[PDB]
Amino acid sequence: GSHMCDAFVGTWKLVSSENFDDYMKEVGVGFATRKVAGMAKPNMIISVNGDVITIKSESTFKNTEISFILGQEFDEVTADDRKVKSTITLDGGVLVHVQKWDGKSTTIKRKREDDKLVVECVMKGVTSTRVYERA
Numbered sequence: 064g065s066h067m068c069d070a071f072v073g074t075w076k077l078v079s080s081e082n083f084d085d086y087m088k089e090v091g092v093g094f095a096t097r098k099v100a101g102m103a104k105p106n107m108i109i110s111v112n113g114d115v116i117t118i119k120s121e122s123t124f125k126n127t128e129i130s131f132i133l134g135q136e137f138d139e140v141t142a143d144d145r146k147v148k149s150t151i152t153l154d155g156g157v158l159v160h161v162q163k164w165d166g167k168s169t170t171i172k173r174k175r176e177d178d179k180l181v182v183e184c185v186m187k188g189v190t191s192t193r194v195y196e197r198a
């Protein structure tokens with residue numbers, strides 16, 4: 064029957080972005096990569112098979128895919144090519160994704176808010192909000 068992650072499953076398209084350039088700066092992304100990545104209107108496809116959650120992010124810039132089990136650390140290569148150690152957990156009904164590399168850490172939270180899937184990206188002082196709607 065039902066599971067807490069059911070509300071995230073689906074195909075989602077980016078419909079707004081706030082402070083993403085400043086967040087990518089903080090994470091270490093170069094000028095050319097930020098300008099190009101900033102144009103992207105990614106889709107995000109979330110699916111579940113048993114305990115394995117798969118998230119694809121796809122755009123003209125790059126396609127990425129992660130598959131994971133809640134709470135189990137995994138190796139991820141991000142869109143900007145950081146090789147990170149990632150752990151995704153559910154905090155109530157919020158998917159909390161922590162990426163660690165070179166002694167730095169960034170937290171990405173995915174939540175449902177009305178008909179949207181809201182993505183909050185935090186690195187040190189720096190917060191970006193990316194809003195997706197069903198495709």
Ligand SMILES: O=C(Nc1ccc(Cl)cc1C(F)(F)F)NC1(C(=O)O)CCCC1
Pocket residue numbers: 087090092096097100105120124127141142143171182184193
């Ligand atoms: O890969 C993503 N973003 C991104 C894009 C391009 C570059 Cl160069 C760097 C990144 C980041 F820094 F997030 F890895 N995914 C998100 C998005 O909304 O677009 C942001 C976090 C989870 C969804």
